[PDB]
C-alpha cells in the first residue's frame, strides 16, 4: 500500500 503526496 503506497500513494503519492496527497493531490
Ligand atoms: C497517499 O494517499 C493515501 C490515501 O489518502 C494516504 O493518505 C497516504 O498517506 C498518502 N501518502 C503520502 C506520502 O502522503
Ligand atoms: C499522487 O500522484 C500520483 C501520480 O504520480 C497519482 O495521481 C495518485 O493518485 C496521487 N495520489 C493522490 C492521493 O492524489
CSV table of N, CA, C and O and ligand atoms in Angstrom, one decimal:
chain,number,residue,atom,x,y,z
A,1,UNK,N,0.8,-1.2,0.0
A,1,UNK,CA,0.0,0.0,0.0
A,1,UNK,C,0.9,1.3,0.0
A,1,UNK,O,1.5,1.6,1.0
A,2,UNK,N,0.8,2.0,-1.1
A,2,UNK,CA,1.6,3.2,-1.2
A,2,UNK,C,0.9,4.2,-2.1
A,2,UNK,O,0.2,3.9,-3.1
A,3,UNK,N,1.0,5.5,-1.8
A,3,UNK,CA,0.3,6.6,-2.5
A,3,UNK,C,1.2,7.8,-2.7
A,3,UNK,O,2.3,7.8,-2.1
A,4,UNK,N,0.8,8.7,-3.5
A,4,UNK,CA,1.6,9.9,-3.7
A,4,UNK,C,1.2,11.1,-2.8
A,4,UNK,O,0.0,11.1,-2.4
A,5,UNK,N,2.0,12.0,-2.5
A,5,UNK,CA,1.7,13.1,-1.6
A,5,UNK,C,0.4,13.8,-2.0
A,5,UNK,O,0.3,14.5,-2.9
A,6,UNK,N,-0.6,13.4,-1.2
A,6,UNK,CA,-2.0,14.0,-1.4
A,6,UNK,C,-2.2,14.3,-2.9
A,6,UNK,O,-1.7,13.6,-3.8
A,7,UNK,N,-2.9,15.3,-3.1
A,7,UNK,CA,-3.2,15.7,-4.5
A,7,UNK,C,-2.0,16.5,-5.1
A,7,UNK,O,-1.1,16.8,-4.4
B,1,LIG,C1,-1.1,8.7,-0.3
B,1,LIG,O1,-2.6,8.7,-0.2
B,1,LIG,C2,-3.1,7.8,0.8
B,1,LIG,C3,-4.6,7.8,0.7
B,1,LIG,O2,-5.0,9.1,1.1
B,1,LIG,C4,-2.6,8.2,2.2
B,1,LIG,O3,-3.1,9.4,2.5
B,1,LIG,C5,-1.0,8.2,2.2
B,1,LIG,O4,-0.6,8.7,3.4
B,1,LIG,C6,-0.6,9.2,1.1
B,1,LIG,N1,0.9,9.1,1.0
B,1,LIG,C7,1.6,10.2,1.3
B,1,LIG,C8,3.1,10.1,1.1
B,1,LIG,O5,1.1,11.3,1.6
B,2,LIG,C1,-0.4,11.0,-6.3
B,2,LIG,O1,0.0,11.3,-7.6
B,2,LIG,C2,0.1,10.1,-8.4
B,2,LIG,C3,0.7,10.5,-9.7
B,2,LIG,O2,2.1,10.1,-9.7
B,2,LIG,C4,-1.4,9.6,-8.6
B,2,LIG,O3,-2.1,10.6,-9.3
B,2,LIG,C5,-2.0,9.4,-7.3
B,2,LIG,O4,-3.4,9.0,-7.5
B,2,LIG,C6,-1.9,10.6,-6.4
B,2,LIG,N1,-2.4,10.3,-5.1
B,2,LIG,C7,-3.4,11.1,-4.5
B,2,LIG,C8,-3.8,10.7,-3.1
B,2,LIG,O5,-3.9,12.0,-5.1
